[PDB]
Structure 1
């Protein structure tokens, strides 16, 4: 299925995923796509911050949901 990701910048890249994909997997889908280390990504859905461990369905995300991307960076 498909969902979107809106970086703060306003940029909106869009991902193919599975309802039972871990967040870890998204973060991974982004690294191999924007080369941003998962361990620097943090992801938010409807104001909730999501956990490396739980799946999309856990958070009730569905086709064409927008997640916003924010970075943690304590390396610069």
Structure 2
């Protein structure tokens, strides 16, 4: 199925995914098109932070959903 991602700079890209895809799988797909390292990525769906170990299914993410790709920050 197809979903949309809004990138760091608000570009809209399209990904081909399945409900069984993990968040890491999606980050990898994003890296393919955008060149952004997985460990620099935070993915958001409808306000909720998406976690590496889990699947699109786990979050009830359906076709033509839009996710938000956000630069991950590391401050202390």
Fold-level match, TM-score > 0.5? Answer: yes
Q: 1:31 to 1:8 in 2, by over 3 A?
A: closer
The RMSD of aligned alpha carbons is: 2.1
Task: Provide the aligned length of Structure 1 versus Structure 2.
Answer: 76
Q: 1:48 to 1:75 in 2, by over 3 A?
A: closer
In structure 2, what is the Cα distance between the partners aligned to 1:73 and 1:10?
18
Deviation above 4 Å: which 4+ runs of structure 1?
73-76
In structure 2, what is the Cα distance between the partners aligned to 1:49 and 1:74?
16
Give the SS at the match of 1:55.
coil
Give the Å deviation of 1:10. 2.3
Alignment gaps of 5+ in structure 1: none
